[PDB]
From a paper:
We have determined the structure of apoenzyme, holoenzyme and a ternary complex with NADPH and product giving unprecedented insights into the structure and mechanism of CobK. CobK comprises two domains, a coenzyme binding domain and a substrate-binding domain, both of β/α architecture.
The apoenzyme and holoenzyme structures at 3.17 Å and 1.63 Å respectively lack the β2/β3 loop which is disordered and the apoenzyme structure is less well defined overall than the binary and ternary complexes. The N- and C-terminal domains have a relatively small contact surface, there is only 304 Å2 of solvent accessible surface buried between the two domains in the apoenzyme and only two connections both comprising irregular polypeptide chain; therefore there is considerable opportunity for the domains to move with respect to one another.
Numbering used by the authors: 1 to 33, 40 to 251
Write the structure that this text describes.
Amino acid sequence: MTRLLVLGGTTEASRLAKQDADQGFEAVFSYAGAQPLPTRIGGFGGVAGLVDYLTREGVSHVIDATHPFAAQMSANAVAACAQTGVALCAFERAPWTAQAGDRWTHVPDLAAAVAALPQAPARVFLAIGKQHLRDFSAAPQHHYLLRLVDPPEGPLPVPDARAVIARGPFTVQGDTELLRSETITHVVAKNAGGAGAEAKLIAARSLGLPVILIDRPAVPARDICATLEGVMGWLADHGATPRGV
């Protein structure tokens, strides 16, 4: 009978994990690099790799609730599950939709984001965390602003840079103050994030400022579950059951 693997790295996953435990499913949870489920922390050694693991563990269903800018995992699951005949929903929160007063532009990747900043010097919230910040040195004439969950640990990759320290979950109040005091002119964001990720967008709207929005990476087709309720429905439809059935 049933045995689920949940690929995590998101709060949607964390929330899915509490359900599965609570309802008494047999499920393992998978970080790369606590949860209320047994937890596996490595990677799998590419595709198959995963196939080997899906086989030896006797996994019936996989839920890819990984981050949405973490595509190589998500696609590896697709292959491994396709080649293995193991079911697979993907629990992704639906990407953000613009609305009156937003002033958004869209770009494929980080590279395109850097290319879309203006010539004239600007003051630019890089709400990317995190990594590949290095890439914006390509436009050095801007005053950038960063939010890192850590201390810098070494200097700042970009010339005119001010960091700050990101506790979370962020809040419209906070993010608006932050942007206003820092006289931010543009925001750069990925189209992803749980928690109070959307606060910065709202604050940008409050102050009438543009966002450059990095669209999610391309990933092969797979059943998509946009909520928890759906995921659990999907699980029922595909014959999954808690302990005891």
